[PDB]
Design a protein around this ligand. Sequence first.
Ligand SMILES: [Zn+2]
Ligand SMILES: [Zn+2]
Ligand SMILES: [Zn+2]
Ligand SMILES: [Zn+2]
Ligand SMILES: [Zn+2]
Ligand SMILES: [Zn+2]
Lengths: 316, 76
Amino acid sequence: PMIVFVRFNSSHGFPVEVDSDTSIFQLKEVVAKRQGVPADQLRVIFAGKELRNDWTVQNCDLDQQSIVHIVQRQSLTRVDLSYNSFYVYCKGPCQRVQPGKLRVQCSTCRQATLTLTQGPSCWDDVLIPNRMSGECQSPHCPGTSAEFFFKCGAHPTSDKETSVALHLIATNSRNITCITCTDVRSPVLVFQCNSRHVICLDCFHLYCVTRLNDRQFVHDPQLGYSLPCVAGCPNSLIKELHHFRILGEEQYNRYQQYGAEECVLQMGGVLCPRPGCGAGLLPEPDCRKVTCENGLGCGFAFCRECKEAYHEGECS
Amino acid sequence: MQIFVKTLTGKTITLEVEPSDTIENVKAKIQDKEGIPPDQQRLIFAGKQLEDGRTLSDYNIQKESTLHLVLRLRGX
Ligand SMILES: [Zn+2]
Ligand SMILES: [Zn+2]
Ligand SMILES: [Zn+2]
Ligand SMILES: [Zn+2]
Ligand SMILES: [Zn+2]
Ligand SMILES: [Zn+2]
């Protein structure tokens, strides 16, 4: 036996115990009795698809305590974008990289009632907004645009309990050796250089930690603060910066802080030199007098060039 | 959902947002809390300057994540 959560026309999810071999029609019957409606007017929507009455729960790839939407009047469970599953960063309760689930909602009413016209065939289809289309089966919604989302697969997750997809991470099903340690591990991160160099998560973490602490991350105005392929290949900066979640919580926050500092500096700004401040400031380019100014700054007025208290004339 | 906005001093503000909120909405919320006019705010996530027309979901910004705030000085 297993439990399936049912959201009945956007209602709060109630559990239904089923068997692996329970048919969708049987599930429609019990929900029908509970809601006082005829079963023939029910439609079951899951993972971007309407489930047919003759399918069984296990045939529909319904995991334990997942959620189906029921409305009135290729499955995303089997998609492979490139076991070879997807991975997310689960911020809680796992606080780690975990195998993920690909799901989809209506981009206009934000409910998982949109059925896809076609399934996604590449990461771009699920990562680029509005790339895929469908019909929101909600009674009063004219939504036609799909909004994909990801959930951690290591425990049950509510409908809005989403996690960021780390689309460079792949199951190492073919035992590719790590470019840096030469060992075989799973999963691995695949850089988007021409060579598609593969690195294990142990070495990727150490790569990130050592480069962060040495201020060797790279600032790119279009992408942010990132790192390229460990082998130095060109045009290989990581674009989805949540991959640096592999740093762990403390170092990830230090990464975000350093990245913002570097962003200020690249925009031609200055970091306030007063001890205990360090506020990021963007004065006029021609301006030598910089004042760290309702509750954000420390009030220090300093010379942009020598970083001492503002002074007339040449520095020193 | 809850997100945090921090200056580079570590000063922290908390906002209630939706993933579909634009960066301009986020700046209006910051102005509502701290009085900083939006024209002086620059928001940064993971080192990337955030654009007024984009949404939090456009940057995959998650519940409880942090944006960094730096200030444009117009006086200077
Ligand atoms: Zn998890
Ligand atoms: Zn809708
Ligand atoms: Zn390795
Ligand atoms: Zn490479
Ligand atoms: Zn200051
Ligand atoms: Zn000076």
